[PDB]
Structure formats: C-alpha cells, structure tokens
From Swiss-Prot, chain B:
Disulfide bonds join C132-C182. Alpha-beta TR is a heterodimer composed of an alpha and beta chain; disulfide-linked. The alpha-beta TR is associated with the transmembrane signaling CD3 coreceptor proteins to form the TR-CD3 (TcR or TCR). The assembly of alpha-beta TR heterodimers with CD3 occurs in the endoplasmic reticulum where a single alpha-beta TR heterodimer associates with one CD3D-CD3E heterodimer, one CD3G-CD3E heterodimer and one CD247 homodimer forming a stable octameric structure. CD3D-CD3E and CD3G-CD3E heterodimers preferentially associate with TR alpha and TR beta chains, respectively. Its main location: membrane. Signal peptide: none annotated. It is linked to Immunodeficiency 7: A primary immunodeficiency disorder manifesting with recurrent respiratory infections, candidiasis, diarrhea, and failure to thrive. Patients show a clear predisposition to herpes viral infections, and features of immune dysregulation, including hypereosinophilia, vitiligo, and alopecia areata. Other features include lymphadenopathy and hepatosplenomegaly. CD3+ T-cells express TCR-gamma/delta, but little or no TCR-alpha/beta. This is T cell receptor alpha chain constant. It comes from Homo sapiens (Human). Glycans are attached at N142, N176, N187. Constant region of T cell receptor (TR) alpha chain. Alpha-beta T cell receptors are antigen specific receptors which are essential to the immune response and are present on the cell surface of T lymphocytes. Recognize peptide-major histocompatibility (MH) (pMH) complexes that are displayed by antigen presenting cells (APC), a prerequisite for efficient T cell adaptive immunity against pathogens. One of its GO terms (biological process) is adaptive immune response.
C-alpha cells in the first residue's frame, strides 16, 4: 500500500541520493523519518498535500519534493556518514482515523570509500556429538563473517523449504571491530532439530545469506571480485554417526 | 511534547510488559501504539481515544487524560512479543503525529529445566574451522560481549522448537586463533557452576 524505492542502499560520501516513497491510496499526508539507536524515529519532513512541504524536526542535510500526490521524494544533496540510517516514509489522511501507514523502510549506509564493501563468507557448523547424547537435540550454527555494509538477510532451508520453527538469528550483526567506523560485520544463526532428524542422511540443511552491495551501475577498478548484491550459502547433510 | 520510557525492558515470560508515554498537550485527542520488529517497519497495534482501557487480545492500552499519559500493557508476555513499541500522539488537526522515541522490549523465556552447556561444533566443509555454542542456560544469565579484539561473542538468542514445546537460550563464540579454546570465550561472559563442559572429541 505504501512502497519505498529501495530496501538497501550503499553510497559514497558526497553522492546525491534520492529516496522515493510512493502510495497509490490517494492519501493527502506524507512523512519522512529516520530511525537510529538511542534517538528513535525523528521527523525529517512532511507534506499535507501535493505541492506542499514543511521542514520536520531534523530537516538539515535533506530536501524533499512532492510534485505529484502519490510520490514524496527525499533527497540527500551530499551524503555524509552521519546520514547512515533507517529511513521510513508514511502516509495518512483525514479519515475516521488519522493513523499513519509506514513503508517497508530503506537502510542507507554512507561510506567514505566503496572499496570497503565486502560480501560475507558463510559457513555451516555441524551439531556436536556430546549435545546429541546429553539432550537428544541437534543444533546447527550458521556463521556469516567479513561483510560490509550490514545489509544481509539470513534464512534456513530444510529439504528445500524455508523453516522458522527452531530458528534463531542474532537480531544485531556484530562489528568485527566496534571502535571502527568502517568495521566489517559478522552474523550468526542457530537451527535446532531433534537428534533423529539430524541423524537422517537424506535430510538437507541449507543456510542462505542474501547480501546487498554494489549494483552493476557502479564501477569497480579493484583486483578482487566486484562486491555485488548476491546470495552466499553453505549446507550440511544429516549424518547417521 | 511526547515522551516514552527509555528501555530496553526485559520481561520474564508470562509477566506483564508495560510501556508508559506522557504528553504535554492536554487537548490531545488521538493516541496510538505501534509495534516494530527488528529491522522491519512500525505496524499499528492499538489506537485509543477515551479514558480507561481498550483491549485487543493480550494487548491493553490505557489512557489517563487528566494525568496526561497513555500506556500499553502486554499481558502474559511471550518471547515473540519482543520488539520495539512506539507511542504516537496527534499534534495538529491535519493529522501530524509526534512519536515517542520507541522502547525495545525483550521477553525472556521461562527456562524450567536449565541444562547449561558449552559445545564445540565443526564446519561441515572443513573439520579445521569451529565455533563454540553456549546453550540451554536460564534467562538470568548474561552473555558479556568480547573484551579481546580477536575473540567474538554474540548476544544471546531465543529459539523455539514449536513441535516439542521447548525454548532455549544460546550464544555463539569463535576466533581465528590457533591456541583458542571455548573456555577462553565462555568464562568472562561467565557460565554457572553446573555447566556441562565436554572435552572436544
């Protein structure tokens, strides 16, 4: 009902950056927010109708456009690292209720050099034998390391189907060097099954990591392979021993 | 204008998780609560307009316009309730909203039979690489982040084996160190005295 033009962006400092919010619901009101740890949501800009815009609480560094009613464009004239954030748009109108409807969100990372973009390495770690005998359960661990930016989506697949029961992924990727602004990240996930399920050699367990990096409209002059948006996966097969 | 209590709030499973939000404008007429899962977008869960309670399943919103506060109570909290909750209040007659800063709420599982253990797991593709798994400890255990630049320890994570009606906490540690053992990670984020610590086979 409310869409945003990108789910994940990585941009160099200085780049002009456009974020689009589009709603086909004929809503008069639209809003742009950013969200950061410790500050929550803050209003950047809003609009009560086509052709209107008013500075929100934190308008500096941003401008907007609303030349058409369906689209509220958020513009970063010259991206700076302090504009790395979760950007959320919303719309509303004067109805029986005045509640806002949020877009899905856009995670923008602003980096000083695109050279620091890296895809994750991904590995799957097999259940301990002592765990199986102590508890009669089997925990697999998926580990993704060395990625930048922290724009990843991890999923477990059992025999070709995505599963959710028995899964836990870290809510936060951890900086592999927290003091560092350009630190690469790591992320782990667990999937736990019964020992008899793991002990079936026909059972297939796949960890899949979707990583969002460079687009093809980005140039790359480096030796290593271009760190594009890609899926990296690892797997294990059940083991009777 | 609009202020919410800070957080994060840790709530044991089965207890009431509660959030309070005060507002400055006595003439405010619309009050909203939003729920936002990690890395997703806020979704409206309750709106309330008059004094007293408003109930929806396990959610109760309460409004006290005389003392100027609105609250959200989550009854019989479960781990899956873990999220950021945000209050919002109208500030003009066009529909502009002011949001509170959001409060992170984490509901910890009720671990009736702790079996804390530290296990070493090996890579499916290479026996040479390993991770450590600290698991099955009760929810009062705290996993401290690494203090060594070369060791990595994750936050604890809650896993639900739905078919078994079984929940468990765990944390993961690893390193690229040659001499690195699992006890090097799990014992500054200290384990309890009854941890099962099998020697690696």
């Amino acid at each position: 009902k409310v869409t945003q033009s990108s789910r994940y962006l990585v941009k160099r400092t200085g780049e002009k950056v456009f974020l689009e919010c589009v709603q086909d619901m004929d809503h008069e009101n639209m809003f742009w927010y950013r969200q950061d740890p410790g500050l929550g949501l803050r209003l950047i800009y809003f609009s009560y109708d086509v052709k209107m815009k008013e500075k929100g609480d934190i308008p500096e560094g941003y401008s907007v456009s609303r030349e058409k009613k369906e689209r509220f464009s958020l513009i970063l004239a010259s991206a700076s690292t302090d504009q790395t954030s979760m950007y959320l748009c919303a719309s509303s109108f004067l109805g029986t209720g005045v509640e806002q409807y949020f877009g899905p969100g856009t995670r923008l990372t602003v980096v000083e050099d695109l050279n620091k973009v890296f895809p994750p390495e991904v590995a799957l770690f097999e259940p301990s034998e002592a765990e199986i005998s102590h508890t009669q359960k089997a925990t697999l661990v998926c580990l993704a390391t060395g990625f930048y930016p922290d724009h990843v989506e991890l999923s477990w697949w059992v025999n070709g189907k995505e599963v959710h029961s028995g899964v836990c992924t870290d809510p936060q990727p951890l900086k592999e060097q927290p003091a560092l602004n350009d630190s690469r990240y790591a992320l782990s996930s667990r999937l736990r099954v019964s020992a008899t399920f793991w002990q079936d050699p026909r059972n297939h367990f796949r960890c899949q990591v979707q990583f969002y990096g460079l687009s093809e409209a980005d140039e790359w002059t480096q030796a290593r392979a271009k760190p594009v948006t890609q899926i990296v996966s690892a797997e294990a097969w059940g083991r009777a021993d | 204008e609009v202020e919410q209590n800070s957080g994060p709030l840790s709530v044991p499973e089965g207890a009431i998780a509660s959030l309070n939000c005060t507002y400055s404008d006595r003439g405010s007429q619309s009050f909203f609560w939003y729920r936002q899962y990690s890395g997703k977008s806020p979704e409206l869960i309750m709106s309330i307009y008059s004094n007293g309670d408003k109930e929806d399943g396990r959610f109760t919103a309460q409004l006290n316009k005389a003392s100027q506060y609105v609250s959200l109570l989550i009854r019989d909290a479960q781990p899956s309730d873990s999220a950021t909750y945000l209050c919002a209040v109208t500030t003009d007659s066009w529909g502009k909203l002011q949001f509170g800063a959001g409060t992170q709420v984490v509901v910890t599982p009720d671990i009736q039979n702790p079996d804390p253990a530290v296990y070493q797991l090996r890579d499916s593709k290479s026996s040479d690489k390993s991770v450590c798994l600290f698991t099955d400890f009760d929810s009062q255990t705290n996993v401290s982040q690494s203090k060594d630049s070369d060791v990595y320890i994750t936050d604890k994570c809650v896993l639900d084996m739905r078919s078994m009606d079984f929940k468990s906490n765990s944390a993961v540690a690893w390193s690229n160190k040659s001499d690195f053992a699992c006890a090097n990670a799990f014992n500054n984020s200290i384990i309890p005295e009854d941890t099962f610590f099998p020697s690696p086979e």
